[PDB]
Amino acid sequence: DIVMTQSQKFMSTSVGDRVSVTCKASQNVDTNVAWYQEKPGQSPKTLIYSASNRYSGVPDRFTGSASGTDFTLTITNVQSEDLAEYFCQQYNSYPYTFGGGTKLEIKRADAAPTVSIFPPSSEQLTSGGASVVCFLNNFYPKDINVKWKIDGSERQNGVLNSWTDQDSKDSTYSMSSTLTLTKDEYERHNSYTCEATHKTSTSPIVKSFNRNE
Amino acid sequence: QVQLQQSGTELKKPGASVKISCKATGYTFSSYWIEWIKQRPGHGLEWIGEILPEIGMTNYNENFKGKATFTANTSSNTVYMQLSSLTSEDSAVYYCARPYDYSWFAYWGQGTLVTVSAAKTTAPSVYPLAPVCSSVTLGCLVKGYFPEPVTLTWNSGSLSSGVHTFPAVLQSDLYTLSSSVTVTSSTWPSQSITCNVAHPASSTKVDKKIEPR
Numbered sequence: 001d002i003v004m005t006q007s008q009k010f011m012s013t014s015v016g017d018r019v020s021v022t023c024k025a026s027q028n029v030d031t032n033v034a035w036y037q038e039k040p041g042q043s044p045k046t047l048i049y050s051a052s053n054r055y056s057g058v059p060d061r062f063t064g065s066a067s068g069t070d071f072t073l074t075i076t077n078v079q080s081e082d083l084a085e086y087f088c089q090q091y092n093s094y095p096y097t098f099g100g101g102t103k104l105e106i107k108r109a110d111a112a113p114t115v116s117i118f119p120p121s122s123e124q125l126t127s128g129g130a131s132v133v134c135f136l137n138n139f140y141p142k143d144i145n146v147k148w149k150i151d152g153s154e155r156q157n158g159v160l161n162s163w164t165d166q167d168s169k170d171s172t173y174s175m176s177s178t179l180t181l182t183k184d185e186y187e188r189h190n191s192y193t194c195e196a197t198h199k200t201s202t203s204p205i206v207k208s209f210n211r212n213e
Numbered sequence: 214q215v216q217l218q219q220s221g222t223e224l225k226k227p228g229a230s231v232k233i234s235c236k237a238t239g240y241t242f243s244s245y246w247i248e249w250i251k252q253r254p255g256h257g258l259e260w261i262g263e264i265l266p267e268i269g270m271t272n273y274n275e276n277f278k279g280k281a282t283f284t285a286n287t288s289s290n291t292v293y294m295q296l297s298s299l300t301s302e303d304s305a306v307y308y309c310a311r312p313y314d315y316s317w318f319a320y321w322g323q324g325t326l327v328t329v330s331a332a333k334t335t336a337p338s339v340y341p342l343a344p345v346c347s348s349v350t351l352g353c354l355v356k357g358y359f360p361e362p363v364t365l366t367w368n369s370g371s372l373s374s375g376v377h378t379f380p381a382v383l384q385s386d387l388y389t390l391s392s393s394v395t396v397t398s399s400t401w402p403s404q405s406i407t408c409n410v411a412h413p414a415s416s417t418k419v420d421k422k423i424e425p426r
């Protein structure tokens with residue numbers, strides 16, 4: 001089956017600039033290729049078809065092109081409402097196949113994450129469980145990594161990670177990591193520390209606490 | 214004008230089957246193929262197959278043969294897709310599409326969320342997260358509800374600034390969601406900050422005041 005490969009899963013752009021989304025077909029699809037846009041929590045929308053032709057109700061900033069097996073979606077004077085994921089599709093032979101998708105984001109200056117560590121609520125401890133919450137806020141670029149150390153001993157077991165989409169107002173990212181465990185093994189140990197490896201720091205940023213205070 | 218109207222959100226047992234509907238209105242329903250597309254997070258867009266309502270003739274992605282079955286009702290202008298033997302894989306948003314004429318898709322439906330889990334409706338537990346004992350960051354943990362969504366505000370939604378509500382994640386069958394709020398270390402504890410969580414599915418509406426440790 002025909003494989004549509006979009007190399008770039010993320011693309012860092014800014015308003016009033018041109019951005020070019022790249023797709024290659026693994027065989028000859030001719031010009032039978034279309035481009036769709038999708039924004040979080042919304043149906044896809046048709047942009048381009050037969051590789052260069054704009055569908056109705058689409059801005060003049062979007063244009064398609066093809067050379068051989070190489071298909072380009074081009075956006076000029078890129079705008080905030082253009083931030084979305086872009087998929088290419090081949091209709092040349094069945095089954096129809098889509099590229100992996102490309103997500104546009106707005107580039108900005110980097111920021112180290114603002115990191116906070118929260119011990120289990122007394123409410124939660126009184127119900128029988130333990131969750132340790134580490135927040136890493138307003139950082140950039142989105143890529144970041146989190147480690148949990150119990151008394152220095154790393155724990156990858158039982159960690160729950162969540163990420164915000166890029167922040168529409170300040171254009172940064174933020175994520176949350178919840179180390180979950182049983183109250184027993186929690187009250188067993190003493191130091192609880194979470195370390196954050198991100199682009200903006202030489203030495204991993206590390207927030208910790210010891211149990212009783 | 215051409216309009217495709219899909220049926221509503223589904224939640225099913227693993228092993229069960231679901232049947233999605235799409236009502237096509239504004240054109241001659243029978244002349245046009247209807248397409249079915251699967252959108253899984255992390256899995257992009259996948260073409261399921263098509264059906265020509267006139268004679269009910271079907272073309273399935275070899276992937277989905279036996280998983281998907283298309284039927285058309287030409288008196289109701291409706292097309293159905295049945296998914297049998299449901300699993301975790303089949304949890305996704307399903308779109309129906311109509312091509313402009315015969316190939317690339319011009320018109321899309323709004324989608325159908327189908328969630329497949331052994332889970333039953335569960336009201337969340339809400340834990341206030343206060344700092345370890347200039348600027349100050351508090352949180353709210355909502356643990357173990359189902360189904361999505363829950364909605365979380367801060368002080369009845371009247372603190373909108375410095376707020377981060379993170380996408381929920383699945384743990385032990387159920388959803389866990391966190392929120393963080395930031396205020397000037399001057400403004401708290403001084404002023405009451407409360408997190409308000411609602412779960413219409415269980416009829417849970419709970420308020421939890423963040424208090425100093």
Ligand SMILES: *[C@@H]1O[C@H](CO)[C@@H](O[C@@H]2O[C@H](CO)[C@@H](O)[C@H](O)[C@H]2NC(C)=O)[C@H](O)[C@H]1NC(C)=O
Nearest residue numbers: 234236269284285286287288289290291292293
């Ligand atoms: C196609 O849709 C029509 C219209 O809804 C269905 O006709 C219905 O049939 C049911 C059961 O026979 C009746 O309760 C309704 O009164 C009918 N609705 C109408 C508007 O006539 C029909 O059953 C559907 N076709 C098939 C084979 O399912």
